[PDB]
Amino acid sequence: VQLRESGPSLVKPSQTLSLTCTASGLTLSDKAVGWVRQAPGKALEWLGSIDTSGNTGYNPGLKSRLTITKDSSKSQVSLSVSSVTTEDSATYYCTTVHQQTRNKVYTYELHVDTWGQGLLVTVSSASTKGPSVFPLAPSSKSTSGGTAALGCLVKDYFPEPVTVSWNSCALTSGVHTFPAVLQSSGLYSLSSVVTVPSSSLGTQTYICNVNHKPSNTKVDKRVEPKS
Amino acid sequence: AVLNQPSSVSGSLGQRVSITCSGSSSNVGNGYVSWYQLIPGSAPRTLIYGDTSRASGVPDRFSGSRSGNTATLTISSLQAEDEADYFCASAEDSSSNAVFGSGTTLTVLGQPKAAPSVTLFPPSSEELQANKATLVCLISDFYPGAVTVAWKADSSPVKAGVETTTPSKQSNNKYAASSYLSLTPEQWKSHRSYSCQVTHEGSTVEKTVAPTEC
């Protein structure tokens, strides 16, 4: 079972957040699709769910701002959050919940089976800004006598998130992508670094692939060694 | 409502630790608690459901138990991969309003100590030709994850223009942090050297970069 969240990653305050969830490979146990979000630094928060018959249950503390509908024909579920505040910035998860009968009486049992990848949503009036990508080139200082460190700098973007891979994901061993810093200007920056063998520096090209969905921007920066 | 969980618990490699999930007589009272694992950078993973049943792919070292108004998730033979956030969840009677716990961060102690290796990158040609200058100090392969970072310009302290991330786990379950120093190309060309000073467990590693030649 696959769940894919879609929707905006930036919404202005007082607007309506609309999210869609497309499911593939539904099984017989997938009887309801629910929505869960997690604000930064806070615990998981249930939002609501909807079952195959169309019944919708909502978090009672938020039902006055939530709506959940479904399109079984397209196999989609939609979530709407009206009049958003900065308290609504979070990673929104699509989930399939299961319902198994313990019967012995009708004692039921509910749990989340599969979790979606999650969509990061930011509530703000600031404007989307694509990233500037610069290379962190290896020199005679950044070598460790056999291994050499190189990377790329993803500077001044908004909003989160930015994903980085290397050589179109062909290079994964020894890669680390740091979390972002929030500058004073309100823009984000992060770095991705990878350690490689020093011998390969003249035979293996290294290209860092930065992807910034909030602005539909993709950057492939080549990292050449300093002469 | 919210189910009460301890903020954080700790255990040594190869040992066992338990996480308690307290509630009232309406949520956990009916009693079919679920357990979920949140590794940063990955989608949440269902561990336990129906108090005791293990989810698909969950190794037998994850067990579940309940006692009245308190459920328990027990992890035996702790591995470094088990460092994550753990949440319990229960259906509040009507089976249409789920409740999650406050969350528990599990940290696995007993890993070998490691000194940090530091790389200091000067600003590149591209950035300097864009009227911008950023010094990037990458710190990796250290443990525990408690470091301090300080910048110098000609051995004089620098406090303005510095942004530093909190240490985070990497592939080999060691920690890494990053720090940045934002300058103008005039400032970068002005001083003779710049230094990133990393202190970890009483000892200090310092990397120096200079505008003169690289």
Residue numbers in the entry:
A (entry chain H): 2 to 82, 82A, 82B, 82C, 83 to 103, 148 to 269
B (entry chain L): 2 to 9, 11 to 27, 27A, 27B, 28 to 95, 95A, 95B, 96 to 106, ...
Paper text:
The cow antibody repertoire contains a unique subset (~10%) of antibodies possessing ultralong CDRH3s, which can reach lengths between 50 to 70 amino acids. The unique CDRH3 structure can be separated into two microdomains where the antigen-binding disulfide-bound “knob” sits on top of a long b-ribbon “stalk” and can bind to both surface and receded epitopes. Ultimately, we isolated a total of 8 and 11 cross-clade nAbs from cow-485 and cow-488, respectively, all of which had ultralong CDRH3s, suggesting only ultralong antibodies were responsible for cross-clade neutralization detected in sera. BnAbs from cow-485 were named Bess, while bnAbs from cow-488 were named ElsE and assigned numbers based on their order of discovery.
The ElsE Fabs all have CDRH3s with 54 amino acids and 4 cysteines, with a 1–3, 2–4 connectivity, Bess7 has a 61-amino acid CDRH3 with 8 cysteines (1–6, 2–5, 3–7, 4–8 connectivity), while the 55-amino acid CDRH3 knob region for Bess 4 (6 Cys, 1–3, 2–5, 4–6 connectivity) has no ordered electron density in the crystal structure. Bess4 is the bnAb with the broadest neuralization activity among the lineage and was able to neutralize seven of the 12 viruses from the global panel (58% breadth), and the broadest ElsE antibody neutralized 67% of the panel. Of further note, the CDRH3 sequences of Bess4 and Bess5 are very similar, but the more potent Bess4 does not have detectable tyrosine sulfation while Bess5 does, which could be due to a YD motif present in Bess5 but not Bess4. To assess epitope specificities of the recombinant mAbs, Bess4 and ElseE2 were selected as Bess and ElsE representatives for competition biolayer interferometry (BLI) against a panel of human antibodies that target known bnAb epitopes on the Env trimer of virus 25710. The BLI experiments demonstrated competition of Bess and ElsE representatives with antibodies CAP256-VRC26.09 and PGT145. To better understand and define the epitope recognized, we chose Bess4 and ElsE2 as representatives to look at the effect of V2-apex epitope mutations on BG505 virus neutralization. Bess4 and ElsE2 neutralization titers were knocked out or reduced 30- to almost 400-fold for Bess4 and ElsE2, respectively, when mutations at position N156, N160, and K169 were introduced. Human bnAbs PGT145, PG9, and CAP256-VRC26.09 are similarly affected by mutations at these residues on the V2-apex epitope, suggesting Bess and ElsE bind to the V2- apex of the trimer spike.
